[PDB]
Write a protein that holds these residues in place. Structure first.
Motif, PDB file in Angstrom:
ATOM      1  N   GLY A 175      38.711  48.963  27.762  1.00 26.24           N
ATOM      2  CA  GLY A 175      39.575  48.999  28.950  1.00 26.24           C
ATOM      3  C   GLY A 175      39.864  47.625  29.523  1.00 26.24           C
ATOM      4  N   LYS A 176      40.150  47.634  30.793  1.00 25.71           N
ATOM      5  CA  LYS A 176      40.540  46.419  31.542  1.00 25.71           C
ATOM      6  C   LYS A 176      39.430  46.131  32.536  1.00 25.71           C
ATOM      7  CE  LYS A 176      44.963  46.494  32.619  1.00 25.71           C
ATOM      8  NZ  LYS A 176      45.821  45.682  31.716  1.00 25.71           N
ATOM      9  N   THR A 177      39.021  44.871  32.556  1.00 30.64           N
ATOM     10  CA  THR A 177      37.902  44.386  33.390  1.00 30.64           C
ATOM     11  C   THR A 177      38.366  43.304  34.354  1.00 30.64           C
ATOM     12  OG1 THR A 177      36.338  44.796  31.603  1.00 30.64           O
ATOM     13  CG2 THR A 177      35.616  43.249  33.253  1.00 30.64           C
ATOM     14  N   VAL A 178      37.946  43.441  35.587  1.00 32.95           N
ATOM     15  CA  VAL A 178      38.019  42.351  36.592  1.00 32.95           C
ATOM     16  C   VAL A 178      36.638  41.708  36.743  1.00 32.95           C
ATOM     17  CG1 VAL A 178      38.656  41.723  38.933  1.00 32.95           C
ATOM     18  CG2 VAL A 178      39.935  43.527  37.767  1.00 32.95           C
ATOM     19  N   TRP A 179      36.531  40.406  36.485  1.00 29.66           N
ATOM     20  CA  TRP A 179      35.228  39.708  36.441  1.00 29.66           C
ATOM     21  C   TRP A 179      35.227  38.647  37.513  1.00 29.66           C
ATOM     22  CZ3 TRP A 179      32.774  38.389  31.110  1.00 29.66           C
ATOM     23  CH2 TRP A 179      31.559  37.740  31.321  1.00 29.66           C
ATOM     24  N   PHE A 180      34.397  38.817  38.519  1.00 27.71           N
ATOM     25  CA  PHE A 180      34.235  37.867  39.653  1.00 27.71           C
ATOM     26  C   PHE A 180      33.193  36.806  39.269  1.00 27.71           C
ATOM     27  CE2 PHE A 180      36.180  41.394  41.832  1.00 27.71           C
ATOM     28  CZ  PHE A 180      36.982  40.759  42.762  1.00 27.71           C
ATOM     29  N   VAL A 181      33.674  35.576  39.312  1.00 23.80           N
ATOM     30  CA  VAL A 181      32.925  34.328  39.046  1.00 23.80           C
ATOM     31  C   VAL A 181      32.795  33.536  40.345  1.00 23.80           C
ATOM     32  CG1 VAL A 181      33.533  34.316  36.584  1.00 23.80           C
ATOM     33  CG2 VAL A 181      35.008  33.113  38.238  1.00 23.80           C
ATOM     34  N   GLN A 203      43.415  34.148  34.591  1.00 22.84           N
ATOM     35  CA  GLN A 203      42.525  33.504  35.586  1.00 22.84           C
ATOM     36  C   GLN A 203      43.209  33.442  36.933  1.00 22.84           C
ATOM     37  OE1 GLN A 203      41.317  30.481  32.276  1.00 22.84           O
ATOM     38  NE2 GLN A 203      39.967  30.192  34.033  1.00 22.84           N
ATOM     39  N   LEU A 204      42.516  33.801  38.011  1.00 20.32           N
ATOM     40  CA  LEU A 204      42.982  33.734  39.406  1.00 20.32           C
ATOM     41  C   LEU A 204      42.032  32.913  40.258  1.00 20.32           C
ATOM     42  CD1 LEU A 204      43.793  37.498  39.873  1.00 20.32           C
ATOM     43  CD2 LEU A 204      45.325  35.697  38.973  1.00 20.32           C
ATOM     44  N   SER A 205      42.597  32.114  41.145  1.00 19.75           N
ATOM     45  CA  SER A 205      41.839  31.393  42.182  1.00 19.75           C
ATOM     46  C   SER A 205      42.802  31.165  43.328  1.00 19.75           C
ATOM     47  CB  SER A 205      41.294  30.093  41.663  1.00 19.75           C
ATOM     48  OG  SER A 205      42.377  29.270  41.298  1.00 19.75           O
ATOM     49  N   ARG A 206      42.293  30.617  44.429  1.00 22.47           N
ATOM     50  CA  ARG A 206      43.175  30.483  45.615  1.00 22.47           C
ATOM     51  C   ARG A 206      44.450  29.696  45.337  1.00 22.47           C
ATOM     52  NH1 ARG A 206      38.801  31.575  47.608  1.00 22.47           N
ATOM     53  NH2 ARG A 206      38.352  32.518  49.672  1.00 22.47           N
ATOM     54  N   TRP A 221      46.717  42.603  29.374  1.00 23.14           N
ATOM     55  CA  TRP A 221      45.504  41.764  29.533  1.00 23.14           C
ATOM     56  C   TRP A 221      44.325  42.681  29.340  1.00 23.14           C
ATOM     57  CZ3 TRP A 221      42.494  43.246  33.759  1.00 23.14           C
ATOM     58  CH2 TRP A 221      43.087  43.939  34.806  1.00 23.14           C
ATOM     59  N   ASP A 222      43.206  42.059  28.997  1.00 21.39           N
ATOM     60  CA  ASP A 222      41.910  42.729  28.807  1.00 21.39           C
ATOM     61  C   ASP A 222      40.970  42.343  29.958  1.00 21.39           C
ATOM     62  OD1 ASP A 222      42.638  43.768  26.222  1.00 21.39           O
ATOM     63  OD2 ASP A 222      42.524  41.651  25.528  1.00 21.39           O
ATOM     64  N   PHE A 223      41.036  41.090  30.393  1.00 17.29           N
ATOM     65  CA  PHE A 223      40.164  40.570  31.480  1.00 17.29           C
ATOM     66  C   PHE A 223      40.989  39.784  32.490  1.00 17.29           C
ATOM     67  CE2 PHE A 223      35.724  41.185  30.118  1.00 17.29           C
ATOM     68  CZ  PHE A 223      35.928  41.608  28.827  1.00 17.29           C
ATOM     69  N   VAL A 224      40.709  40.016  33.767  1.00 19.63           N
ATOM     70  CA  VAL A 224      41.024  39.071  34.860  1.00 19.63           C
ATOM     71  C   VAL A 224      39.728  38.372  35.241  1.00 19.63           C
ATOM     72  CG1 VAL A 224      41.638  38.916  37.285  1.00 19.63           C
ATOM     73  CG2 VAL A 224      43.106  40.241  35.669  1.00 19.63           C
ATOM     74  N   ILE A 225      39.735  37.070  35.187  1.00 14.41           N
ATOM     75  CA  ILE A 225      38.624  36.197  35.662  1.00 14.41           C
ATOM     76  C   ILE A 225      39.030  35.607  36.990  1.00 14.41           C
ATOM     77  CG2 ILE A 225      37.554  33.974  35.229  1.00 14.41           C
ATOM     78  CD1 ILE A 225      36.134  35.943  33.576  1.00 14.41           C
ATOM     79  N   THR A 226      38.332  35.964  38.040  1.00  8.62           N
ATOM     80  CA  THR A 226      38.784  35.692  39.404  1.00  8.62           C
ATOM     81  C   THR A 226      37.638  35.138  40.212  1.00  8.62           C
ATOM     82  OG1 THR A 226      39.912  36.511  41.365  1.00  8.62           O
ATOM     83  CG2 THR A 226      38.591  38.118  40.110  1.00  8.62           C
ATOM     84  N   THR A 227      37.986  34.248  41.139  1.00 13.47           N
ATOM     85  CA  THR A 227      37.072  33.877  42.219  1.00 13.47           C
ATOM     86  C   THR A 227      37.140  34.967  43.283  1.00 13.47           C
ATOM     87  OG1 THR A 227      38.681  32.616  43.375  1.00 13.47           O
ATOM     88  CG2 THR A 227      37.403  31.405  41.678  1.00 13.47           C
ATOM     89  N   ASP A 228      36.483  34.696  44.400  1.00 15.93           N
ATOM     90  CA  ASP A 228      36.432  35.563  45.584  1.00 15.93           C
ATOM     91  C   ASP A 228      37.802  35.813  46.234  1.00 15.93           C
ATOM     92  OD1 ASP A 228      36.503  32.882  46.635  1.00 15.93           O
ATOM     93  OD2 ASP A 228      35.681  33.641  48.527  1.00 15.93           O
ATOM     94  N   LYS A 237      44.948  47.529  37.859  1.00 15.74           N
ATOM     95  CA  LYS A 237      44.821  48.849  37.195  1.00 15.74           C
ATOM     96  C   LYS A 237      43.670  48.696  36.223  1.00 15.74           C
ATOM     97  CE  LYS A 237      47.046  51.766  33.596  1.00 15.74           C
ATOM     98  NZ  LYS A 237      48.259  52.515  33.164  1.00 15.74           N
ATOM     99  N   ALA A 238      42.446  48.698  36.723  1.00 18.86           N
ATOM    100  CA  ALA A 238      41.259  48.318  35.918  1.00 18.86           C
ATOM    101  C   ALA A 238      40.293  49.489  35.842  1.00 18.86           C
ATOM    102  CB  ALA A 238      40.572  47.106  36.486  1.00 18.86           C
ATOM    103  N   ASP A 239      39.417  49.460  34.856  1.00 18.38           N
ATOM    104  CA  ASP A 239      38.367  50.494  34.833  1.00 18.38           C
ATOM    105  C   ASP A 239      36.959  49.900  34.889  1.00 18.38           C
ATOM    106  OD1 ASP A 239      38.057  49.760  32.224  1.00 18.38           O
ATOM    107  OD2 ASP A 239      38.369  51.736  31.325  1.00 18.38           O
ATOM    108  N   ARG A 240      36.835  48.592  35.046  1.00 19.02           N
ATOM    109  CA  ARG A 240      35.497  47.999  35.142  1.00 19.02           C
ATOM    110  C   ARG A 240      35.578  46.728  35.981  1.00 19.02           C
ATOM    111  NH1 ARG A 240      32.128  45.889  29.811  1.00 19.02           N
ATOM    112  NH2 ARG A 240      33.990  44.464  29.792  1.00 19.02           N
ATOM    113  N   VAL A 241      34.588  46.537  36.809  1.00 19.51           N
ATOM    114  CA  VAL A 241      34.313  45.231  37.457  1.00 19.51           C
ATOM    115  C   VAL A 241      33.005  44.698  36.899  1.00 19.51           C
ATOM    116  CG1 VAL A 241      33.689  44.132  39.643  1.00 19.51           C
ATOM    117  CG2 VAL A 241      35.705  45.560  39.515  1.00 19.51           C
ATOM    118  N   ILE A 242      33.034  43.442  36.489  1.00 17.44           N
ATOM    119  CA  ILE A 242      31.828  42.641  36.180  1.00 17.44           C
ATOM    120  C   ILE A 242      31.686  41.717  37.375  1.00 17.44           C
ATOM    121  CG2 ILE A 242      30.767  40.920  34.718  1.00 17.44           C
ATOM    122  CD1 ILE A 242      32.113  42.308  32.351  1.00 17.44           C
TER     123      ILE A 242
END
Ligand code: YG9
Ligand code: YG9
Length: 435
Positions: A175-181, A203-206, A221-228, A237-242
């Protein structure tokens, strides 16, 4: 909700419809009652989403994010949190809004904290009403609030560096993952590792959010890598948060320099908002939340709450009175109220260093309070040796506006001006006189 002296915390769970259902009802009632109303969006992305929710209601969108032709007779204004505090600080007429609505009212950027302080003080004075919309009000202790759909919560070790083995669960998912770094640099390393494993990563940041978030709609996309920044109403439209469960904490050391401490644990509110990216669709039970650490009170002594006092000390309220922080988040800072109030000309410099200069509040304040004018960049080069900024493990250098090559060595060192390549490139341009 709409009566003077009322501050209402609309604390419905994440995805409960505060923005798309409740807000339009509040706005219709406000127009009926001829209440001059402001709606505060955390980002331009959310401002544009609100236009969809509010379409055919008479709202003035005080943002270029929205293409609408106004009637000129609207009594409801919509702007970003930062726009509201900006306009309060400037010699710009801001109406004394009868009703003050803040969406994503957990936002911990200095301008958002300041806006809450200003609005809650007007409510306490008996002058106004306010509604703060957030699932996670300040001091919330619950990282696992209710959701539209059941979530699978799992405590697991989450990589914070490139990996070769031992985390197959990360890449085995279809699925699709949102990963908070915790940081841009940290995200860059994880993103590169995922890309090498054949994943499609955004990748997302301010600094990139307002333009890169569109890729989440336009690209597979498979992953969004995001800050806060994706804690503030970013919908996927995701099915997992890391969730690393980690952040960086700007800390003022000996009132003399700002460091980015950590990474360290997120607050409960932050964890709840990260998890709250999923479990939003009652037709899709069993979205996953994989979390790599505990929560803690890392907003305590966080520079943003001191920076919010620097803003509020420079906003006119009534005579020499000064707005207080919103009570539930007021103990996160030990400041003398009014200690940062500047005279007219130093206040203008402070504002310009934040607006055109794009400097952190704390750093803008040090320069303005030193009696330095906006275009005088001598302070970027005359600091102590330990304030030398590095680029690829040697001192960063710029050509000054005089044409002289000089080491970047600011008199006040704020780690936020050089926390990543893009930040340092912008600060180099500033030191060079290029804005
Ligand atoms: C329809 O009414 C309005 C529309 C836009 C604005 C200002 C928008 C803006 C972007 N540009 C800057 O000057 N302030 C702001 O964020 C004010 C009223
Ligand atoms: C949360 O408040 C903050 C306000 C300003 C900044 C610096 C932005 C910037 C572009 N300007 C540059 O000189 N370095 C840079 O990345 C960072 C955080």
């Amino acid at each position: 909700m709409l009566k003077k002296k009322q501050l209402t915390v609309l604390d419905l769970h994440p995805g409960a419809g505060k923005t798309r259902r409740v807000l339009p009802e509040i706005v219709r009632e406000a127009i009926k009652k001829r209440l001059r109303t402001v709606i505060l969006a955390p980002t331009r992305v959310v401002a544009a989403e609100m236009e969809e929710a509010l379409r055919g209601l008479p709202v003035r969108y005080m943002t270029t994010a929205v293409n609408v032709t106004h009637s000129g007779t609207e009594i409801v204004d919509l702007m970003c949190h930062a726009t509201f505090t900006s306009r309060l600080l400037q010699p710009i007429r801001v109406p004394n809004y009868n009703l003050n609505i803040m969406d994503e009212a957990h936002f911990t950027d200095p301008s958002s904290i300041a806006a809450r302080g200003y609005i809650s003080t007007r409510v306490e004075m008996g002058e106004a009403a306010a509604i703060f919309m957030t699932a996670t009000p300040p001091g919330t202790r619950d990282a696992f609030p209710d959701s539209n759909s059941p979530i699978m919560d799992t405590e697991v070790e989450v990589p914070e560096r490139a990996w070769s083995s031992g985390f197959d669960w990360v890449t085995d998912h279809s699925g699709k993952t949102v990963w908070f770094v915790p940081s841009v640099r940290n995200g860059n390393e994880i993103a590169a590792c995922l890309t090498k494993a054949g994943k499609r990563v955004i990748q997302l940041s301010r600094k990139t959010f307002e333009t890169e978030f569109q890729k989440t709609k336009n690209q597979e996309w498979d992953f969004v890598i995001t800050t806060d920044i994706s804690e503030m109403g970013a919908n996927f439209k995701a099915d997992r948060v890391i969730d690393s469960r980690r952040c960086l904490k700007p800390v003022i050391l000996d009132g003399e320099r700002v460091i980015l401490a950590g990474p360290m644990p997120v607050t409960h509110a932050s964890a709840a908002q990260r998890r709250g990216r999923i479990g939003r669709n009652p037709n899709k039970p069993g979205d996953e939340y994989m979390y790599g650490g505990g929560c803690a009170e890392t907003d305590e002594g966080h520079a943003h709450w001191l920076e919010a006092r620097m803003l509020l000390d420079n906003i006119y309220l009534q005579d020499g009175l000064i707005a207080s922080l919103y009570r539930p988040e007021a103990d996160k800072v030990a400041a003398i109220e009014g200690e940062f109030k500047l005279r007219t000309e130093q206040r203008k410099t402070f504002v310009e260093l934040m607006k055109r200069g794009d400097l952190p509040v704390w750093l803008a304040y040090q320069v303005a309070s030193a009696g330095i004018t906006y275009t005088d960049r001598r302070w970027c080069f005359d600091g102590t040796t330990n304030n030398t900024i590095m680029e690829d493990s040697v001192p960063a250098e710029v050509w000054t506006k005089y044409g002289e090559k000089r080491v970047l060595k600011p008199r006040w060192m704020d780690a936020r001006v050089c926390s990543d390549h893009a930040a340092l490139k912008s600060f180099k341009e500033f030191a060079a006189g290029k804005r």
